[PDB]
Structure formats: C-alpha cells, structure tokens
Amino acid sequence: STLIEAIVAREVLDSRGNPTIEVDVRLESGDVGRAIVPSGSTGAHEALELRDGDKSRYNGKGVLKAVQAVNEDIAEALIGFDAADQIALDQELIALDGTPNKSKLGANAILGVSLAAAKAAAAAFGLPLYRYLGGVYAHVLPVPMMNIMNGGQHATNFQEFMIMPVGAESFREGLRWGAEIYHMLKKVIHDRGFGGFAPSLTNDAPLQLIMEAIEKAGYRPGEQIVIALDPATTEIFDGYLKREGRSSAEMVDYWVDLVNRYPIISLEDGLAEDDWEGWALLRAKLGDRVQLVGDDFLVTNVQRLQRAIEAKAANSILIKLNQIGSLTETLSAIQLAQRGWTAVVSHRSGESEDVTIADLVVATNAGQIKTGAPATDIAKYNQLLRIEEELGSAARYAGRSAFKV
Amino acid sequence: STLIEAIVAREVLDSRGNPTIEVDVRLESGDVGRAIVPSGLRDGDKSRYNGKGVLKAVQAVNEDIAEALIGFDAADQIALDQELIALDGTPNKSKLGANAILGVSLAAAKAAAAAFGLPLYRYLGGVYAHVLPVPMMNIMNGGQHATDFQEFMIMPVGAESFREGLRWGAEIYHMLKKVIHDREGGFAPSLTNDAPLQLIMEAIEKAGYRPGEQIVIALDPATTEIFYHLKEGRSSAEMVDYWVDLVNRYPIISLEDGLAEDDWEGWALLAKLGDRVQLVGDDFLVTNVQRLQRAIEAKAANSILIKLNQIGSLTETLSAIQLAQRSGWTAVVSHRSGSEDVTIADLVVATNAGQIKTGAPATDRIAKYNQLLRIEEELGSAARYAGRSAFKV
Ligand SMILES: [Mg+2]
Ligand SMILES: [Mg+2]
C-alpha cells in the first residue's frame, strides 16, 4: 500500500529559468508525491548535482542525466520498497550511489526521490507533510529572516540585510509587519533619491534606511523588529571593505561596535569560510547576545558542524537540503545542531514552486526560516500561513523563544 | 460524492506581496480543490497592508457563498456559476467580489476534476483537449516601471513541441542578456525604436535560431497609454502605416493594443494588416462579451486577450473563449501582476487555444510553463504543439 509502484522524473525549469529535476513517486495506494529540487553545481566538497554539459541545450545546464538516473537506476532499485520507511529508503539511495558526495546518481536525483517518497507516504496516511515528518509535537511557526536590502556582489557602490518580526503574536501578523516595512522601505529609498532592493550606497547607510523604514511603518526596533545580517565575508576575504577603504581580530571589533548601535540579533558569515581561528573569537565576544550563523563556513556538513560544535566556533547553522542530498541526513544535521545551536532552514537562489522547506521548518520546530523579500519564489510564506491555520489552537509562533540568547 | 461539503477561504500573498484570496472547496468524496485569485473586494483598512487586505472577500466566501453552495453538485460547473452570479446579483460582481466568485468557481472545478480522477484540462475540455500553446515569451520591456512600447515578446512557432519551444525561448532570453551587456519580466535598458527589434534579431541568430521560420516577434506597444505621441519626436492613419513598415522589415506575427482604447475607426482600418498580422484587443476589448461581439461585426481585430480575473467566473471565461474562436478570432489567455496558481495552463489546453501570454522564462511565470510541460508529457502521443497552426494569419 505505501509500497512504491512507480518512480518518474522530468526536466522542468527553476525560478532562474534553468533546468531542474522534478520527481514523482507513486505508491500501491494510488498516492503520488512530487518534488522539485533546487538546482545548483560542478565544484566544492559537498553533495554534487548532475548537470549534462550538452552545450546545444540550455548552455550545458540540462538535467537529462539526473532524470535518467531516476527513471532507470533508482526506479529499478526502489520499486517495491516501503516509502513509509524514510531512513531505510535514504540509506538505499546512498548505497545505490556508492560515492561520498552523491556524484554517480546526482544529489538532485537522490533528494528528489527522498522528498517525493516522504510526500507520497504523507498523502497515503492522509497527513500534512510537517505532521508526517515530525510527528505529534510539530507545531512551531518560524520567525522569518526577510530580505529587504541587497549589497556587495549585487551592489554598484555587505551582501544581505534582513528584518525579523520577533514581536509578532503569530506568523500571519509577522508576515504582514515585514511586508508593510518592505513597502515603506521603497518609499524611504525613493524620498532620498537612490529579492530585496539593491541601490548605490557607507556600510551604515543601509542600517539607517532600515531603522527609518521600521519606524515610519509604525514598528518598534528591538521589541517588535530585529535585524539579521549576512555580509558574506568569504566574498571580501587575502587576510579583509572597498566601501570604507580599509583592510580577523579587527573585523570582530567592527561587529561588536555595530551590534551596540543597531538591533542586530543574528550575523551570518561575519568572518570567512575557513577562518576557524576568528569564528571562535567572534563567539567569545558576541555569542551570548548575538546568533552567529555558519553558511559557507559550515556548508551544511555534519563533520564541519561537529568540529564547530566542539571548537565553540558558532551557535547557529544554515540548513540547505540540496547541499546534503537526502531528507534523513538533513533531519540528522538539524537534530545534531539543535541538541544547543539553532538550525536555520534556508531556501536556494535556484528555488521553485516546491514548498517542502515550509513543512520541514515546522516538522523540526526549527524556529527560524531564511526566505527572500515578501514579493512567488512567497509560496513558502503561503505554506506557513496554511500550516498555522491547519494547526489552529496548537500553533505557536517561535517569537523571541526562536533565539538561544 | 461530488456534492459540496465545505467552502473555506483565507488571505494569502500574491507574487507582488499583496493580499489575495485562496479558496478551498471540499466535496463529499473528500476531494479538495484549491484556487488563488489575485486582485487588480478590497478592504480599505489602512491599519492592515495599507488598505490592500481581502478579509471582506474571505468573509463573503466563508459565510455567504459557503451557506448558499453547501450541498450543490460541484460537477455542474454552469449551474454552480449561475448560482454564484445570482447570489451576488450585480452586473460586475460588486456585492461578493469578482475574486470571491472566481475563487469558488475555479476551486469547485478542481475539486470535481480530482473526484473523477481527471487532470483539469481533460475535466474542462473533454476528450479533444490536447493542443499545447505557442508561448508569447516576454524578453524585453519599456513604457513604464514595475522606448515608447511596453512589451517585446518572442514566439517559438517553429518548434516541434512545447518542451522544445520553451528551451528555444529560454536560450534566446539568456542570449539577449549577453547582447545587452555588449552595448518585471524582460530586460528594460534605456535606448531608437528599431534598436529593441535589432537586439532581439541579434539574440535570435546568436542563439542559433532562424527568424520567421522558427522564431517570430509579438508586440505589446500599449499605444492606449500614450493617447499618438511617440515622444522618436513624432505626433491614427500614420500609426497604421508605421506598423506596416515594421512588419515588412521584421518578423512581427502579432500586435496588441496597436491603437488606443476607443480608436474603433483606426482599429477597423488596421483591413490594412489584419490580413497578415494578429491584432490583439487587450484594453480595446477588456474581455467583455458585449464589447467583443461589437468588434466581431465591425471587424476591428482578429484576436482577444483573455483575463480570467476580469471575467469573474469559469463558465463566462469559456463562453468568451468560444465566441471569439467560433467567429474566426484567436483567444490568447493571459496572466496578471499578482500567484502560484496554474489554472490558465490547464484552461489553455482545455480550449485548444493555441497561444498563451504568461511572461519571461524566470516562479509565478515558470510554474505555468512547468504545468504545460507536465500536460504535454501526460498527453503523450495525443499531444500537439500548435506551431504555425496557432495563427489565423
Ligand atoms: Mg549566506
Ligand atoms: Mg497589454
């Protein structure tokens, strides 16, 4: 009944218009689960996604080989397998591959089947995905990290500036607050002549505009709205700031200063990718009052995570599904971090209409989600609205409790 | 079994982050149909989303519509839609809201399709629904913010399938970015009015494609927004002779709102090109049956842009599509500024419409393209891409 009867994949497009894999898992019950994998990519020591390299189709970005790995290899191995056994399924996919970075079948083919199987099974038990995945205690709505301003790589003259509606009584209220501030920040930028807005800018100017946008929308900094930053220090690191004309210990000094002036609750990649020495020093200085998130620093790798847990290098990790390659290994990484860091479930640049991360964040009661501006790549914000509604009296918005501060 | 048991609405966000209505219809079979209907019933409460809230349309669904339709057979689309029209009792669906009526109308069709275990295009169109549309892919912009002409679209007419045609357009979209670098939706760089066309023509041949034979241009100059003052410096009969010149030099297959909202004399004059070009009425027809029938007898255009949200119901939309089609015109189904809903992909195949205007290949737009890919695959051998057969010349 929850036994797999068919596995089929197809080449669809992502939010950037690039090919991506969509997997359908059909059970003996008639239930079909469908998953779209965020694509992205021939580099780095992490789970690798299979791209075609046929330059006569989508400039080599095709995904027909990952499609073939699903339609032939995975289908032949997994037809008759019980889809309700998530862990066993995932270890059957990992073993069928045989490579430590999912390079033979593709991390995109493995994740697609892993996610589609979970959805098929959820629909067979007649359960929503968050409940099927996390059981009876899945009820916490995350505080979103809402992108309102861009920079660095996307600037003309620190990469991301986000707002977090901590003070909201529900996700529905929190989303509205953030949407109202986003719309107000458009006016604030326009009446000064300049996912989120990326204009020519000091490094203090974006924080000032955001403070004005929070205030003019009618919200209280600190109490209601807080700032989460992703300067992406790996992008500006041969030992570090062109916008300020200056050149690891001194970078910490800049962050302590800024955190004391602005209501910054979280800082992601505040120090570079392999600057393990500096990361530990940043925790001793800010860790007690600021969330320090490892993105390029931890690359959702459990070995790097355990090293940073032991070294006391951060207190939060950014979780990316496509970097791990299976649902079981993602849940394992979320749990490892949580048992006392925060796990921040994040979307990808090459995302889709697929809303799995909205259910995954509630299933694990993660407390925080990292999505873009409230402007469809939105579907995730709508899923969280549907989940909060469905949970009724049982729903709880994380709020301040989202933070291990 | 297909009898309605519950009708539920909620306020969600649209692709612009504006509140919109999402309606769920539940049948006695346990099947649920869900639809998102973006707005152009608006709240006007300034202490919520700066008055753009849709709580009143949500209340119209959860109370008025739910009480009146619980127990109604969802499989009877026409009767359900005339029950909605009668409950509202206003010519422009102003009591309950067009968004409230469309939401229930679409969600009821989806609930019923799922109860019969049928994909929406087959449930809506029957056994002959199989024609994949030629997309009007927006690759270049102008006019306003989100040259004098608002939209520049490519059409992969020469493709053997929708899958192939989608790849062509996507490749040309990416190639045009590399050409703009060497000088909402499509690229909008400030610029001669012939330059966008020459840039598009360069991107076509640089991607490895042939104009006319494989790729054709479709235009939405939206001349109604400039009423003709082409502030090129120029200042109706001349405008007609201007488009004649373009068609002669460039592979333009279609022209939308080539003349003003109410320039009926000129619309009927452009006889001048009606024979070699598709002339689309957007602001000129505003999807109204009364105005559409007027332009049919007048021979003022040979195509109508279909906006589901402007019509308000599924039955009235199919009615408007059929009227245009059976009078020799093409019906071009179009998107809106505001969601993840992919109904128009199933609606375009259900009616074998041959063309879709759903924007740049970049989730609100991509989701519709993905639905068309799933539809083509599901049809298998039965599928047919319209190609040149999409056009009435
Ligand atoms: Mg990051
Ligand atoms: Mg138009």
Numbering used by the authors:
A (entry chain A): 2 to 41, 43 to 159, 163 to 199, 207 to 213, 215 to 250, 252 to 253, 255, 257 to 263, ...
B (entry chain B): 2 to 41, 52 to 157, 161 to 197, 206 to 213, 215 to 250, 255 to 258, 260 to 263, 266 to 300, ...
Relevant lines from the article:
Enolase (2-phospho-d-glycerate hydrolyase, EC 4.2.1.11) catalyzes the conversion of 2-phosphoglycerate (2-PGA) to phosphoenolpyruvate (PEP) during both glycolysis and gluconeogenesis in all three domains of life. Enolase is a metalloenzyme activated by cations of bivalent metals, such as magnesium (Mg2+). In the present study, we purified enolase-1 from Chloroflexus aurantiacus (EnoCa), a thermophilic green non-sulfur bacterium that grows photosynthetically under anaerobic conditions. Each monomer of EnoCa contains an amino terminal domain that consists of a three-stranded β-sheet packed against three α-helices and a carboxy terminal domain that consists of an eightfold α/β-barrel; both domain features are typical of the enolase superfamily.
High-resolution crystal structures were obtained for the apo protein as well as proteins with 2-PGA and PEP bound in the active site. The enolase crystals belonged to space group I4, which contained two monomers per asymmetric unit assembled into one homodimer. The structure of the apo protein and that containing 2-PGA (2-PGA EnoCa structure) of EnoCa exhibits the so-called “open” conformation, where the L1 loop is away from the active site. In the beginning of the apo EnoCa structure refinement, the difference map peaks were refined placing Mg2+(I) atom in coordination with Asp241, Glu285, and Asp313, and then three water molecules in an octahedral manner. The nature of the metal ion could not be unambiguously determined from the metal–oxygen distances of between 2.4 and 2.5 Å. Hence, the octahedral coordination sphere, the presence of Mg2+ in the crystallization buffer, and the fact that Mg2+ is the natural ligand of enolase, is consistent with the modeling of the difference density peak as an Mg2+ ion.
